[PDB]
Design a protein around this ligand. Structure first.
Ligand SMILES: CC(C)NC[C@H](O)c1ccc(O)c(O)c1
Ligand SMILES: CC(C)NC[C@H](O)c1ccc(O)c(O)c1
Ligand SMILES: CC(C)NC[C@H](O)c1ccc(O)c(O)c1
Ligand SMILES: CC(C)NC[C@H](O)c1ccc(O)c(O)c1
Ligand SMILES: CC(C)NC[C@H](O)c1ccc(O)c(O)c1
Ligand SMILES: [Cu+2]
Ligand SMILES: [Cu+2]
Ligand SMILES: [Zn+2]
Ligand SMILES: [Zn+2]
Lengths: 153, 153
């Protein structure tokens, strides 16, 4: 299998760890881990284009969108490659992450390694919020924590 | 051109920003930036195999060595792909980094993106130190700061 990993950190209480595994070349990718320090509710969860955190999470740019599509949710045909939806935190501030996605990859054209995974302030409206920004970012707000996705053993 | 970047941080005071640019496909790579919080002198500077910083810089594994060679310096034929030698800190505690390297790449099998850049405790002896460990790590000691190398705009 191919494996990757991301340490999420930022300028506040939000921290996390997210693991990735892809059993077959170009096959589905399992994404799992835990994020703590979150306000209760939904937090947008995306791979952004660049693995640049020079000035913090802002430096990562827009969602990873190699195919020039509008923002959506992971189950949509019309989505960014980086659109992984939301993670959901309880009152404990913890979101347990367990996702399988067939659009991201750990090899090829849609490869997410070397790019930034970001957990956002607010909910991602999955492109259904009614303004143009919904179709770009899902109105998920600021970047609470992030890290560069790296190759794992 | 193709560009990459790495933010260095650790348990202590060492912090850095390192930029990479590769003008031509498969061409040499320019590596430049600054690292502060260092003791004066030489500090080993390497790309390590894994972009895994789960438990800190130790998680990054050994020097990146896709071609199964021994450790050396950046101007040696016999070196690991990750062997970028030493950076040098002055009495300001800052290393002003400006390297060109013909072995690392930002694509292909020598791609360092998604892997970890590490700055070490002590000098790298470039494989000339006279023990077995010289030929593996250059005796450069602990990992002061590191980051996962990401794709840049
Ligand atoms: C190592 C275990 C905890 N990971 C889950 C498993 O490797 C996996 C599950 C679903 C997938 O789509 C996958 O590529 C890989
Ligand atoms: C502002 C632009 C993107 N137009 C909004 C679009 O006509 C629209 C209307 C109703 C909806 O429910 C919606 O998600 C999107
Ligand atoms: C902005 C400056 C630092 N760019 C350096 C230049 O793009 C460059 C110099 C030497 C090289 O080998 C290279 O790939 C690229
Ligand atoms: C990607 C942007 C935000 N960073 C540019 C980088 O900080 C930089 C550009 C030109 C330089 O000469 C330099 O030392 C450093
Ligand atoms: C800031 C402390 C560590 N003093 C550094 C000193 O003023 C200094 C400045 C510039 C240098 O190049 C240097 O070697 C030493
Ligand atoms: Cu995002
Ligand atoms: Cu090293
Ligand atoms: Zn998106
Ligand atoms: Zn080495």
């Amino acid at each position: 299998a191919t494996k990757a990993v991301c340490v999420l950190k930022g300028d506040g209480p939000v921290q996390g760890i997210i693991n990735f595994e892809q059993k077959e070349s170009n096959g589905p990718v399992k994404v799992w881990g835990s994020i703590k320090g979150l306000t209760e509710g939904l937090h947008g969860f995306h791979v952004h284009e660049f693995g640049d955190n020079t000035a913090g999470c802002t430096s990562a740019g827009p969602h990873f969108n190699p195919l020039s599509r509008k923002h959506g949710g992971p189950k949509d045909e019309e989505r960014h490659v980086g659109d992984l939806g939301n993670v959901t935190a309880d009152k404990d501030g913890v979101a347990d992450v367990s996702i399988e996605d067939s659009v991201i990859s750990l090899s090829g054209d849609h490869c997410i390694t070397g790019r930034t995974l970001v957990v956002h302030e607010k909910a991602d409206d999955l492109g259904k919020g009614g303004n143009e920004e919904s179709t770009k970012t899902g109105n998920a707000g600021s970047r609470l924590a992030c890290g560069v996705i790296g190759i794992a053993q």
